[PDB]
DNA sequence: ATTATGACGCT
DNA sequence: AGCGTCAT
């Protein structure tokens, strides 16, 4: 009752760029705008691998991980943009720089947590309090929420998509109690107004469109964001959670899309997030551990306490390349040449990072995969990163991995290497 | 023969 | 530390 937490203390948003690498390429090349198109890396093997897909192309069934030759079977008129190649490898700099454009705009509105190259969480609790004080108790017009969906509405006693959106928004706003400054539903609504403003600023200042979720925590904001894509935002209220979760597959919730989520389903014999409410906290802890159990107990009730971390910059800067099938590295010279290519890209990015962000990496992590190994990484070793110098880093990387070579001939490398990875970590202020 | 990333948990 | 999981 009066002592039961409801997890309604914060307003959190998640902003997710729509088909991000495609938009970056469509901004640059207007011929690609409003077309079925995709972004591909490399071209020689089966036309290249697709890593991003426009919504026009998704209508034809084109997906990530598809080979472009195969995507062309579904969509013969599919347009393609290729990821830049430098030093023999895909180079993602254009997309990282475009990401910074968006993250810097978002940071004007609130503290952000960079979740990925094109996603950021926003803690809007303070901004909402501020806006509410401005508002001086005046109601919120639907005109302030032109791209907002209210999840679960309309409900109760037109056949167009936008019509339904407005119907739900009207029901929501009709019900709002705008004279209570501490009403969680009102706070979420003001949060959604701010996110409309944020999303308009992003589009105005970069050309890029995005979707967003607004709720009381990160998991719900993330879930909300995906409900109405692209170019829309969705408010998931605390009250919407029981119905929403009642048919929500467990794997849809962030962190439950893999083995843990499969185990929840198998061990408990349930399918939907809402079904978790029927277990005690101790029961859940008994199967999934103390941390996961407590997290699941609260999460299935719409409650999560994970903070929006004040972090706008990546914590690591890495460079990696696969060498699949026949291209696996089988000589010493090969391994050393590619470590150098990786180190040269890493040095370039590190030097830029040091100038931009007043920090220096102090640890170099070297990872490799050996042919035959099922795991993405076979071996990981660290050494000191004391100078931003590509020849030094590549020499150091070789040193920490060179005894992995089983070959009695040290000219040759065996078993052949199917992946190389250099990662700079442990930043200190500079 | 997806590939190139990146954060965080466990022991 | 080195490995594993989960995610864009
Ligand atoms: N598995 C991957 N491999 C390489 N790059 C990826 C992968 N997943 C995502 N990316 C890149 C390309 C994406 O444009 C970008 C953002 O990813 P993501 O948000 O999952 O999809 P998206 O932005 O392309 O479409 P959506 O509109 O569905 O969000 O990150
Ligand atoms: Ca996205
Ligand atoms: K994303």
Nucleotide C8, nearest residue via CA and C1': A116
Tell me, yes or no, whether A147 and A224 share the same domain.
yes
Query: A281: part of which helix (H) or strand (E)?
Result: helix A281-288
For residue A83, the ligand closest to its alpha carbon is 1
Secondary structure class of A279 (helix, strand, coil): coil
Are A294 and A315 in a shared domain? Answer: no
- Separation between Cα atoms, residue A5 and residue A301, nearest integer Å: 10
Are A285 and A228 members of one domain?
A: no
A380 forms beta bridges with A367
Nucleic acid strand C: bases within 7 A of protein CB: 1-8
For tokens 């660290």, name the residue. Answer: A382
Place of tokens 């109601």: A139
Which DSSP helix (H) or strand (E) runs through A211? Answer: strand A210-215
3-state SS class at A16 = strand
Give which of A76, A77, A49 is closest to A63, Cα–Cα.
Answer: A49
Domain end (from A73, A88, A103): A88
In this structure, the answer to whether residues A380 and A239 fall within a common structural domain is no
Which residue has the closest alpha carbon to B9 C1'? A291
Note the CA–C1' distance, A392 to C7, in angstroms: 32
Same domain, yes or no, for A357 and A209? Answer: no
The residue whose CB lies within 8 Å of the most ligand 1 atoms, and thus the one to mutate among A15, A16, A18, A20, is A20
Q: Which domain holds residue A353?
A: 308-430
Closest among A25, A34, A30, A18 to A80, alpha carbons compared: A25
A11 and A156 in a common domain = yes
Resolution in A: 1.5
Same domain for A210 and A163? yes
Cβ contact A265 with chain B strand, < 7 A: no
How many distinct structural domains can be found in chain A?
4
Cβ atoms A54, A35 nearer than 8 A: yes
Residues across chain A = 430
Q: Does ligand 1 have an atom closer than 6 angstroms to the CB of A392? A: no
Q: Is the CB of A374 under 7 A from strand C?
A: no
How far apart are alpha carbons A312 and A11 in whole angstroms?
A: 19
Technique used by the depositors: X-ray
- Helix A184-206, helix A125-135: angle, nearest 10: 100
Angle at A202 between CA A211 and CA A35, to 5 degrees: 65
Domain shared by A165 and A301, yes or no = no
């Amino acid at each position: 009752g009066p002592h039961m937490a409801t997890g309604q203390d914060r307003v959190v948003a998640l902003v997710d760029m729509d088909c991000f690498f495609v938009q970056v390429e469509q901004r640059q090349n207007p011929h690609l705008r409003n077309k079925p198109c995709a972004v591909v890396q490399y071209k020689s093997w089966k036309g290249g691998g697709i890593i991003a897909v426009s919504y026009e192309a998704r209508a034809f069934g084109v997906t990530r991980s598809m080979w472009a030759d195969d995507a062309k079977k579904l969509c013969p008129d599919l347009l393609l943009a290729q990821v830049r190649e430098s030093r023999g490898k895909a180079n993602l700099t254009k997309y990282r720089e475009a990401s910074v454009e968006v993250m810097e705009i978002m940071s004007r509105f609130a503290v952000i947590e960079r979740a990925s190259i094109d996603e950021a969480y926003v803690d809007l609790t303070s901004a909402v309090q501020e806006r509410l004080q401005k508002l001086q108790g005046q109601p919120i017009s639907a005109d302030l929420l032109p791209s907002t969906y209210i999840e679960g509405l309309p409900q109760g006693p037109t056949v167009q998509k936008e019509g339904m959106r407005k119907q739900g928004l009207f029901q929501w706003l009709d019900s709002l109690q705008i004279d209570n400054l501490t009403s969680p539903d009102l706070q979420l609504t003001v949060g959604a107004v701010i996110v409309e403003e944020m999303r308009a600023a992003i589009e105005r200042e970069t050309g890029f469109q995005c979707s967003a979720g607004i709720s009381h925590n990160k998991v719900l904001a993330k879930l909300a964001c995906g409900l109405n894509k692209p170019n829309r935002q969705t408010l998931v209220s605390h009250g919407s959670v029981p119905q929403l979760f009642s048919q929500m597959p467990i794997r849809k919730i962030r962190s439950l899309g893999g083995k843990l989520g499969a185990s929840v389903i198998e061990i408990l014999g349930i399918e939907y997030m809402g079904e978790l409410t029927q277990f005690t906290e101790s029961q859940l802890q008994s199967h999934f551990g103390e941390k996961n159990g407590s997290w699941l107990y609260a999460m299935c009730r719409g409650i999560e306490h994970d903070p929006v971390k004040p972090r706008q910059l990546p914590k690591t800067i890495g460079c990696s390349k696969n060498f699949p099938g026949k291209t696996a590295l089988a000589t010493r010279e090969q391994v050393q040449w590619w470590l150098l290519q990786l180190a040269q890209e890493l040095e370039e990015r590190l030097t830029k990072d040091r100038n931009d962000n007043d920090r220096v990496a102090t640890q170099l992590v070297v990872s490799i995969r050996v042919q035959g190994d099922k795991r993405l990484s076979s071996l990981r070793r660290c050494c000191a990163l004391t100078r931003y110098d590509a020849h030094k880093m590549s020499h150091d990387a070789f040193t920490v991995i060179k005894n992995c070579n089983t070959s009695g001939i040290q000219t040759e490398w065996s078993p052949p290497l199917t992946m190389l990875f250099l990662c700079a970590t442990k930043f200190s202020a500079s």
